[PDB]
Amino acid sequence: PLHSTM
Amino acid sequence: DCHLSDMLQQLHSVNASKPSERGLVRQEEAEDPACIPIFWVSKWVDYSDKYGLGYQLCDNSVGVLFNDSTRLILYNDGDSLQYIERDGTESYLTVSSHPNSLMKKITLLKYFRNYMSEHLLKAGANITPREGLPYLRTWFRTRSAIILHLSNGSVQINFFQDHTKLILCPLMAAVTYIDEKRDFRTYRLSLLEEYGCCKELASRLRYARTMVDKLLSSRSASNRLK
């Protein structure tokens, strides 16, 4: 659900 | 750990001198490209709600800090693995070899690996790491950033709003700053105390000091359980 920059 | 205290001391010296409150800031004089880190987190995915936090280091190695506080690392050779228990006890093995008790976690790591590889940008892609594997000791998020603490003493802080990032390396008493344009610069903290820095870097270094204390507090709490 939460992640670093795509 | 000991590195956290060393880093706190390094940050204190700089912050106490109020580097952005100088007659003429000369930030560029504190630069030292030779202090660029060997390792930093290029990407991460937070699925701590069910399995843990996966991440990739700049050398293409992958890792996962599971919710049970254990870590599994897959080297860039795609086979060598390193497992770290809650204590910190490490064990070396490979995927080829089938350590049955680790097959679930190995499988989970691979899904994390594929996701990061396909959907996320590699931070510091334009940076050539320094010549030489650490694991993610701990991490946490605030309303404005994610804090990552590597087992080699390094502390990385990624800011959500502007995508700027700080990589603090205690051994070389240095800090690498990546701005929103993805430009990067490495500084010796002792030279920043001497020559100063812009208000933005100054603000981030003050916040970093606060984040390092939070890491120490979390460690003191986690110690009470072990």
Residue numbers in the entry:
A (entry chain B): 1 to 6
B (entry chain A): 371 to 502, 508 to 601
From the article:
For instance, polo-like kinase 1 (Plk1, a member of five Plks), a validated anticancer target, has a unique exterior surface (polo-box domain, PBD) composed of charged, hydrophobic, and hydrophilic domains whose phosphorylation-dependent protein-protein interactions are crucial in regulating mitotic progression and cell proliferation. A large body of evidence suggests that PBD interacts with phosphoserine/phosphothreonine (pS/pT)-containing motifs, and directs the N-terminal catalytic activity to specific subcellular localizations. The polo-box domain consists of two different binding regions, such as the unique, broader pyrrolidine-binding pocket and the conserved, narrow, Tyr-rich hydrophobic channel, among the three Plk polo-box domains (Plks 1–3), respectively. The N-terminal Pro residue on PLHSpT is crucial in conferring specificity by docking its side chain into a unique hydrophobic core (hereafter called the pyrrolidine-binding pocket), which is surrounded by the Trp414, Phe535, and Arg516 residues.
Therefore, we have generated various N-terminal cyclohexyl-truncated analogues (PL-56, -57, -74, and -75) to study the binding nature of PL-49 with respect to the variation in chain lengths on Plk1 PBD-binding regions. However, the binding affinity of these analogues displayed equal potency (PL-56, -57, -75, and -74) when alkyl tethers were increased from one to eleven by atoms on PL-49. Moreover, in contrast to the previous reports in which the longer alkylphenyl group increased the binding affinity, the N-terminus cyclohexyl methyl moiety on PL-57 was strong enough to attain the observed Plk1 PBD-binding affinity in comparison to PL-74. To determine the binding nature of PL-74, we solved the X-ray co-crystal structure of PL-74 in complex with Plk1 PBD. As expected, when the cyclohexyl moiety at the N-terminal of PL-49 was extended, the resulting PL-74 was directed to the Tyr-rich hydrophobic channel and lost the dual-binding ability. Similar to the previously reported peptide derivatives that were bound to the Tyr-rich hydrophobic channel, the side chain of Tyr481 rotates away from the domain to open the channel. But, in contrast, the position of Tyr481 was parallel to the cyclohexyl moiety because of the closer and deeper hydrophobic binding interactions from the N-terminal substitution on PLHSpTM.
